[PDB]
């Protein structure tokens, strides 16, 4: 009898865990929707066609959406709690007739200033103009990386001779998905490093690396995402893509949690 009553309470608590999961997923979709909206619009602002008057309009709209991610991270409550503020620590749901067989739940903070929502960046000290091209004997570009999984990855990029400063960035993007590159206004490369998988500083070496600027590691997030020149525009889309990957990964974890619990109800009922 105690087990039977305990199971009835267990499916009640477990169902509450499902409701808390889907309420977070409800604002999850909106967070993804805004992030995509910035990414396409940052692509528009990356144009060389628009003037500074158009880009400041972009930044006005971007900072408008930026306030939205901060607001939704605090608004989502579910009856006085704080799902997305980050104040929600690991809460264990008792889903059994007896005690001790609970399941932990972690909902990560999703404020636009969160570290995992952005990543590191590096800038070339000296730019290269249009007439400049990659010269022979100065094409090697070896990058040392620290990775959360299969760490200590060293990737070498051999730029094709005669490539200018722009198609060089495209070549680096194609060769590896761990690094995003783009030139801003004079040829300076903006290497991007996604924080949630490429933790740690990246070391640059090779003849081409010495030809350009090694640059320092600067932390940038969605909150610091500012697009007023096309250089920040190419930087922002890289930042947004990292944010979208993080949000989607957190959504998948919540989804598997929902399936664990959906399979928990019919088990407990059985």
């Amino acid at each position: 009898n105690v087990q039977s009553r305990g199971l009835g309470v267990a499916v009640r608590n477990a169902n509450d865990g499902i409701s808390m999961a889907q309420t977070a997923e409800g604002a999850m979709k909106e967070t993804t929707n805004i992030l995509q909206r910035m990414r396409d619009l940052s692509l528009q602002s990356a144009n060389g066609s628009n003037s500074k008057a158009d880009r400041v309009a972009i930044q006005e709209e971007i900072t408008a959406l930026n306030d939205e991610l901060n607001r939704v991270a605090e608004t989502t409550s579910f009856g006085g709690n704080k799902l997305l503020n980050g104040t929600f620590a690991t809460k264990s749901f008792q889903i059994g007739a007896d005690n001790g067989e609970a399941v932990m739940l972690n909902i990560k903070d999703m404020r636009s200033d969160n570290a995992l929502m952005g990543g590191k960046t590096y800038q070339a000290a000296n730019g290269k103009d249009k007439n400049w091209g990659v010269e022979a004997g100065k094409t090697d570009l070896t990058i040392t990386l620290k990775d959360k999984r299969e760490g200590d990855v060293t990737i070498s990029i051999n730029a094709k001779e005669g490539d200018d400063i722009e198609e060089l960035a495209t070549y680096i993007n194609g060769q590896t998905d761990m690094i995003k590159a783009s030139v801003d206004e004079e040829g300076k490369l903006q290497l991007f490093t996604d924080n949630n998988r490429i933790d740690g500083a990246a070391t640059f070496g090779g003849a081409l690396a010495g030809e350009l600027g090694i640059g320092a590691a600067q932390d940038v997030t969605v909150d610091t995402l500012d697009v007023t020149t096309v250089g920040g525009a190419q930087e922002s889309v890289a930042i947004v893509d990292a944010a979208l990957k993080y949000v989607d990964s957190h959504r998948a974890e919540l989804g598997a949690f929902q399936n664990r619990f959906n399979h928990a109800i019919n088990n407990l009922d059985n």
Binding site: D16, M20, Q22, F78, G79
Partner: protein, 53 residues
Amino acid sequence: INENVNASKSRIKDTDFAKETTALTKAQILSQASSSVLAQAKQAPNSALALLG
């Protein structure tokens, strides 16, 4: 959020008619059976008296 909190305002406040009505039915036969026990138990003193005139 409003859609999902309304879902959470179910099985917390809302009742499901399926498991509840069968509980009501089980109690109806429980009342009908228990009452008939009383009717059968009224004659225990009556047959108790019958041993002596």
